[PDB]
Amino acid sequence: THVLRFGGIFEYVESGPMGAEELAFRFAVNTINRNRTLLPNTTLTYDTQKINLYDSFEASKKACDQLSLGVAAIFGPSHSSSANAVQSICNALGVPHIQTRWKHQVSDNKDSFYVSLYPDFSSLSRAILDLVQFFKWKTVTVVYDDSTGLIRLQELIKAPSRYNLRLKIRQLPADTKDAKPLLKEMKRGKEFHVIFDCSHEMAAGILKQALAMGMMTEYYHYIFTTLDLFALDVEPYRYSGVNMTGFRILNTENTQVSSIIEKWSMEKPDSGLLDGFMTTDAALMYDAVHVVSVAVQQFPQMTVSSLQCNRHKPWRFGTRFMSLIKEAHWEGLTGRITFNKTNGLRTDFDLDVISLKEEGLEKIGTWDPASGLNMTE
Amino acid sequence: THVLRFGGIFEYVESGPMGAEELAFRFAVNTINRNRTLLPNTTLTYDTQKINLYDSFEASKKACDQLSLGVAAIFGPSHSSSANAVQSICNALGVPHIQTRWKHQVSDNKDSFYVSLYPDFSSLSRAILDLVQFFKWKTVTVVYDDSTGLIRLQELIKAPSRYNLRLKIRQLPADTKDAKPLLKEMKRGKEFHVIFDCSHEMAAGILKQALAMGMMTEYYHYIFTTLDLFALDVEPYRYSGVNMTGFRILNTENTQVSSIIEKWSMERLQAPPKPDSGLLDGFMTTDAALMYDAVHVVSVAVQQFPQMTVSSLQCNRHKPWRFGTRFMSLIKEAHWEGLTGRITFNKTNGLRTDFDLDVISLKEEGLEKIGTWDPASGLNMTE
Ligand SMILES: *C1O[C@H](CO)[C@@H](O)[C@H](O)[C@H]1NC(C)=O
Ligand SMILES: *[C@@H]1O[C@H](CO)[C@@H](O)[C@H](O)[C@H]1NC(C)=O
Ligand SMILES: *[C@@H]1O[C@H](CO)[C@@H](O)[C@H](O)[C@H]1NC(C)=O
Ligand SMILES: *[C@@H]1O[C@H](CO)[C@@H](O)[C@H](O)[C@H]1NC(C)=O
Ligand SMILES: *[C@H]1O[C@H](CO)[C@@H](O)[C@H](O)[C@H]1NC(C)=O
Ligand SMILES: *[C@H]1O[C@H](CO)[C@@H](O)[C@H](O)[C@H]1NC(C)=O
Ligand SMILES: *[C@H]1O[C@H](CO)[C@@H](O)[C@H](O)[C@H]1NC(C)=O
Ligand SMILES: *[C@H]1O[C@H](CO)[C@@H](O)[C@H](O)[C@H]1NC(C)=O
Ligand SMILES: [Ca+2]
Ligand SMILES: [Ca+2]
């Protein structure tokens, strides 16, 4: 019957295996094909290209090759510089670029052929601050990994002039093994209330150091910025009495979503991560392939065209497809998906709020930008 | 005699005239040609391409065209996304990419064919903090414009856990005309000690609002993050008693450098100045002094590589330039006294981390020098 091709560009270091993102992409396409409710008369196909991390030149070439084969969208690469380059290309040729990871939005940038499935920083920033205020903290130490961490917490960093939060800002070193001297200063400083802005792998690492340092006890409360908090091996810490709170956008309470995360798990020792948990970077890619497909269903006329980066001739159906994608609505692995009319950023979404109880990490409320917290005391 | 071609890629909105950067580039090339000490037997030529702001796709195309014509270096474009794209291309074809503006350095990025003439943020961050500590401030309000402002002041933002600075962080709105409500909060807050992290055009704008608000008086001390502080019309404020302190990397005290900045104003000031700006007309900004210095520093390297010639390279093919590796190495080793002082790059990352700043403050006479800073000495205030 009818057939439509998507492009995929996935970043990696060294060689195989496949990464989580390229896996979720393929997995979503195979699933959707078998669904008879979604794209009934339509069958999805794809080209996948692998590139080095941070080689925007290679990302450009591969994106141009794919636009030449003909594709209805490029689920372009993850990291800032390659992603900005593929987005500029996609904008010139009017093919939608689908992103799954946050990158810094420049105001005066006029690209319009992209949406991003990642929960926008502005909203996450607020939900961190909302949580801090619910715990009634007046003192807090924000610890971040790299520059861009600062940006994800700007709403929080600007609070000390409106509300009554004194706050200290510290930076992690490159390696978490180097983190004892930093943690010792926090300990002497009596900094019991701490937000860690860093990847979930960094968080697994910094917790081990915190244990060694006598800082996983009932005296300490740690808020985690990472959405992959639920991926952390928490067996070493649940009996200790520490408080760990963070957020989760992966909708694991829904039974339909649990069964999908399982089929995924089916297809390291010193990590401190659970093995075979579906991370957020990958649930988002899988959701992106669905949301875009909901749009394809509403545009049966559309077909791919072989476009050449040489020539300034855009894709006929681009403008209309891009518009359908931005209007799309979908219940996926990561809850309500809905983009912002204005900038194509996902600014409205649903978070579960999770905390460490002796039983493990469990849900204790919700957050959404219109309600603030809905804690279930 | 011998001839060498440089490439230039300059960003703009709408159409002409030429911008400061493209002008300083051309001006540097014309000057160097006439110098008989620098590149005596060598004559510089160039291709210039103009692109839209934030169109990395177009920047890629124009860079590829230039590598095809054949060029010994691309004085690639200014803004993050286009600059990162031209840098990746330049790295694959082993032609040096010369930058004049800061952009965020990703650690795990392996590009090695570039240097940056802009004074690195890490060092500027420290010199801000050094100054604050010399004024013995224990309280300070940092006001920034956009996200990346945060990064330029990270050294400062992390101080409140080592030293004894309480500090409040506020953000400007998009337009400075919208800044009264923010300034009113600072006034009620008794925030007399304030660092403005923002462009010099924003700073000219925010000062007018501060005057309106009764905040240009002896009670207020403003430290300015911008290196183009010296470009601000200061006539409205010097009689008032406010304290304005900032830094300047443009070496205006040197007589040779003053005469060069003048010849610039004559061909430039000749074209459009503005009345309601709050900037002096025809002052050479830092963005442009750096481009002009970049063309010189790179030339000092060309003098030491007479064998070198340009090759027509194709982005199609993975075949780099023979002379690239050696030229890039000569550039990173180069040393030069230009409009912006000692130029010297960091062996490690090709970033300009060691440089000399004049420290300037508003006296009734105007903006004047009151010391110096360099990363190895801290402040050398001349009391
Ligand atoms: C496809 O199938 C699953 C169950 O087999 C269903 O839950 C899902 O909603 C279907 N897709 C659509 C868009 O209805
Ligand atoms: C996106 O639009 C939302 C409405 O959902 C609006 O409240 C908000 O201002 C926009 N987000 C951003 C980051 O501008
Ligand atoms: C929070 O509560 C209100 C009603 O009390 C509800 O409308 C809103 O959807 C709740 N948030 C979530 C995520 O359910
Ligand atoms: C502060 O302002 C007064 C009056 O303009 C001036 O005498 C003094 O030199 C200034 N202080 C500094 C830091 O230069
Ligand atoms: C396929 O959609 C339904 C079957 O699910 C069918 O009735 C319809 O005619 C087909 N769609 C098109 C566009 O022909
Ligand atoms: C911290 O609070 C959580 C609720 O979020 C509670 O379940 C836990 O017992 C507390 N930690 C301890 C044991 O002090
Ligand atoms: C070229 O001449 C100018 C003055 O004419 C001088 O300042 C400059 O240093 C000269 N170049 C060199 C490297 O000697
Ligand atoms: C450049 O390398 C790092 C990063 O800026 C810095 O620590 C070092 O001191 C610099 N090297 C020199 C020679 O100044
Ligand atoms: Ca199907
Ligand atoms: Ca000459």
Distances (CA, A) of A319 to A72, A92, A309, B364: 11, 11, 18, 59
Whether A41 is in the pocket of ligand 5, judged by its Cβ within 6 Å, is yes
DSSP structural state of residue B99: E
Indicate the SS3 state at residue B320. coil
Question: The tokens of A371 are what?
Answer: 């309600």
For residue B105, give the DSSP letter. P
Can you spell out the DSSP letters for B235-251? Answer: TTTTTS--EEEEEE-S-
Residue entry with tokens 């084969």 = A69
What is the Cα–Cα distance from A225 to A247, expressed in whole angstroms? 7
| Rounded distance between C-alpha atoms, residue A39 and residue A293, angstroms | 7
Q: Measured in angstroms, how far is the CA atom of residue B40 from the centroid of ligand 10?
A: 5
Element (H, E) at A332: strand A329-332
Residues of B in contact with A80 (CB under 8 A): 106
The H or E element containing residue A156 is helix A154-157
Non-local (6+) Cβ contacts of A350 within 8 A are A249, A251, A335, A336, A366, A367, A368
Please choose, from the candidates A279, A285, A292, A218, the residue with its C-alpha nearest in 3D space to the C-alpha of residue A252: A279
DSSP per position, B262-283: HHHHHHHTTS---SSS-B-TT-
CA distance A227 to A277: 13
Does the beta carbon of B185 lie under 8 angstroms from any beta carbon of chain A? Answer: yes
Structure-token pair, residue B121? 């943020």
**Angle A279-A281-A287 (CA atoms, 0-180°, nearest 5)?**
100
Q: Is the CB of A107 under 6 A from ligand 2?
A: no
CA–CA separation, A190 and B358 (whole Å): 41
Q: Pairing mode, if any, of strands A243-248 and A193-197?
A: unpaired
**Ligand that lies nearest to the alpha carbon of residue B120, given by its number in the listed order:** 8
Neighbours of A164 (CB within 10 A): 8
Phi, psi at residue A92, to the nearest 5°? Answer: -65, -35
Helix pair angle (B324-333, B286-303), 10° resolution: 120
Residues bordering ligand 10, an ion, CB closer than 5 Å: B 33, 35, 39
Give dist(CA B37, CA B58) in Å, integer: 38
Asked if residue B54 lies in contact with residue B82, where contact means CB atoms within 8 angstroms, the answer is yes
The Å distance, Cα B94 to ligand 4 centre, comes to: 51
Nearest residue to B331 via CA among B357, B299, B308, B363:
B299
Q: Which of B13, B56, B93, B109 to mutate to test the interface with A (most CBs of A within 10 A)?
A: B56
Interatomic CA distance for residues B88 and B82, integer angstroms:
10
Distance (Å, whole) CA B311 – CA B86: 18
Question: Which ligand approaches the C-alpha of residue A356 most closely?
Answer: 6
CATH superfamily of domain region A120-248+268-277+349-377? Response regulator (3.40.50.2300)
Where would I find the H helices in chain B? 20-34, 56-69, 80-92, 121-134, 147-152, 154-157, 180-188, 200-212, 255-268, 286-303, 324-333
The Cα B230–Cα B225 span in angstroms is 12
How many CB atoms neighbour CB B267 within 10 A? 12
By the 10 Å C-beta count (0-12 exposed, 13-18 middle, 19+ buried), B112 is classed as middle
Chain A residues lying within 8 Å of B146, measured CB to CB: 107
Other C-beta atoms lying within 10 Å of the C-beta of residue B301:
23
Longest CA–CA separation in chain A, Å: 69
Closest residue on chain B to A170 (Cα): B158
SS3 A23: helix
> Is residue A30 classed exposed, middle or buried when 0-12, 13-18 and 19+ CB atoms within 10 A define those classes?
exposed
**C-alpha torsion angle, residues B186, B187, B192, B197 (rounded to 10):** 40
How is residue A274 written in tokens? 């659970």
B107 to A174: CB separation less than 8 angstroms, yes or no = yes
The top-level CATH class assigned to B1-119+249-270+284-354 is alpha beta
Measured between CB atoms, does B174 come within 8 Å of chain A?
A: yes
**Cα distances (Å, whole numbers) of residue B1 to B16, B32, B37, B377:** 34, 15, 15, 46
Q: Report yes or no: B268 and B261 within 8 Å, Cβ to Cβ.
A: no
Distance from C-alpha of B104 to C-alpha of B144, rounded to nearest angstrom: 17
> Under a CB-based contact definition with an 8 Å cutoff, are residues A125 and A152 in contact?
yes
Q: Hey, whose CA ends up nearest to atom 12 of ligand 3?
A: A366
Smallest CA–CA distance from A191 into chain B, residue: B161
The reply to whether A110 touches chain B by the CB within 8 Å rule is: yes
Q: List all residues whose CB is within 6 A of at least one atom of ligand 8.
A: B 122, 346-349, 353-354
Assigned CATH topology for domain A1-119+249-267+278-348: Rossmann fold (3.40.50)
Instruction: Tokens for A207, please give them.
Output: 């917790």
Ordered DSSP codes for B127-170: HHHHHHHHTT-SEEEEEESSHHHHHHTHHHHTGGGTSS-EEEEE
Q: Is the CB of A40 under 6 A from ligand 5?
A: yes
The contacts of residue B368 (CB under 8 Å, 6+ apart) are: B360, B361
Find, among A39, A113, A76, the residue nearest to A323 by Cα. Answer: A113
Three-state SS for B342?
strand
Pick A161's closest partner by Cβ from B54, B158, B170: B170
Is-contact B229 B247, C-beta < 8 A? Answer: yes
**Which among A57, A88, A157 has the least Cβ separation from residue B57?**
A88
Q: What are phi and psi of B188, to 5 degrees?
A: -55, -35
d(CA A178, nearest CA chain B) in Å: 17
B1-119+249-270+284-354 and B120-248+271-283+355-383 share one CATH topology? yes
Which superfamily, per CATH, for B120-248+271-283+355-383? Response regulator (3.40.50.2300)
Task: Judge whether B90 and B63 are in contact, CB under 8 Å.
Answer: yes
Determination method here? X-ray
B221 touches B210 (CB < 8 A): no
Residues 60-79 on A with a CB inside 8 Å of B are 60
Planar angle of CA B372, B131, B226, nearest 5 degrees: 80
Q: How many C-beta neighbours within 10 Å does residue A40 have?
A: 11
Hey, is the C-beta of A84 within 8 angstroms of any chain B C-beta? yes
Q: Three-state DSSP class for A169? A: strand
Longest CA–CA span in chain B (Å) reads 69
- Kindly calculate the radius of gyration of chain A based on its CA atoms and give it in whole angstroms: 22
Q: DSSP character for B98?
A: E
* CA distance to A20, A256, A284, B35, per residue, from A11 (Å): 11, 30, 16, 48
- What's the CA gap between B176 and B93, in Å, rounded? 43
Burial class (CB in 10 A: 0-12, 13-18, 19+), A336: middle
Closest CA to B279 of B359, B177, B205: B205
Query: What is the number of the ligand 1 atom nearest to the C-alpha of A294?
Result: 13
In a 13 Å sphere around the CA of A330, the CA atoms on its Cβ side amount to 25
Phi, psi of A113 (to 5 degrees): -90, 55
- In 3D space, the residue among B350, B321, B327, B349 whose CA is nearest the CA of residue B89 turns out to be B321
Half-sphere exposure of B59 (CA within 13 A, CB side): 34
Residue A139, chain B, CB below 8 Å: the answer is no
Say how many Å lie between the CA of residue A22 and the centre of ligand 1: 22
**Cβ count near A316 (within 10 Å):** 13
Query: Residue B60 and residue A111: Cβ atoms within 8 Å?
Result: no
Rounded distance between C-alpha atoms, residue A137 and residue A148, angstroms: 24
Contact indicator for B217, B271 with CB cutoff of 8 Å: no
Long-range contacts of B326-329 (CB under 8 A, 24+ apart): B327/B72, B327/B73, B327/B96, B327/B301, B327/B302, B328/B94, B328/B96, B328/B112, B328/B113
Interface test with B, best of A114, A157, A169 (most B CBs within 10 A): A169
Q: Measured between CA atoms, how close is B196 to chain A, in angstroms? A: 15
Instruction: Report the alpha-carbon angle A62-A68-A71, nearest 5.
Output: 90
In a mutational test of the A interface, the residue from B168, B169, B313, B316 whose CB has the highest number of chain A CBs within 10 Å is B169
**B3 CB-side CA count, 13 A:** 5
Identify the residue whose C-alpha is closest to ligand 2 atom 5.
A340
Distance of CA A288 from the midpoint of ligand 5 (Å)? 24
Beta-carbon separation of B88 and A56 below 8 A? yes
Quick one: residue A94, left, alpha or beta (phi over 0 = left, psi -120 to 50 = alpha)?
left
DSSP code at position A106: P
| B247 neighbors B227 (Cβ within 8 angstroms) | yes
Query: Which amino acid is present at B126?
Result: R
Distance CA B132, CA B141 (A): 11
DSSP string across A286-331: HHHHHHHHHHHHT-TT-------TTS----TTHHHHHHHHHH-EEE
* Cα B263 → chain centroid: 20
The 3-class SS string of A198-234 reads CCHHHHHHHHHHHHHCCCCCCCCEEEECCCCHHHECC
Task: Tell me if B70 sits within 8 A of B311, measured CB to CB.
Answer: yes
Identity of the amino acid at A181: P
Q: Domain limits of chain A?
A: 1-119+249-267+278-348, 120-248+268-277+349-377
Residue B319: helix, strand or coil by DSSP? coil
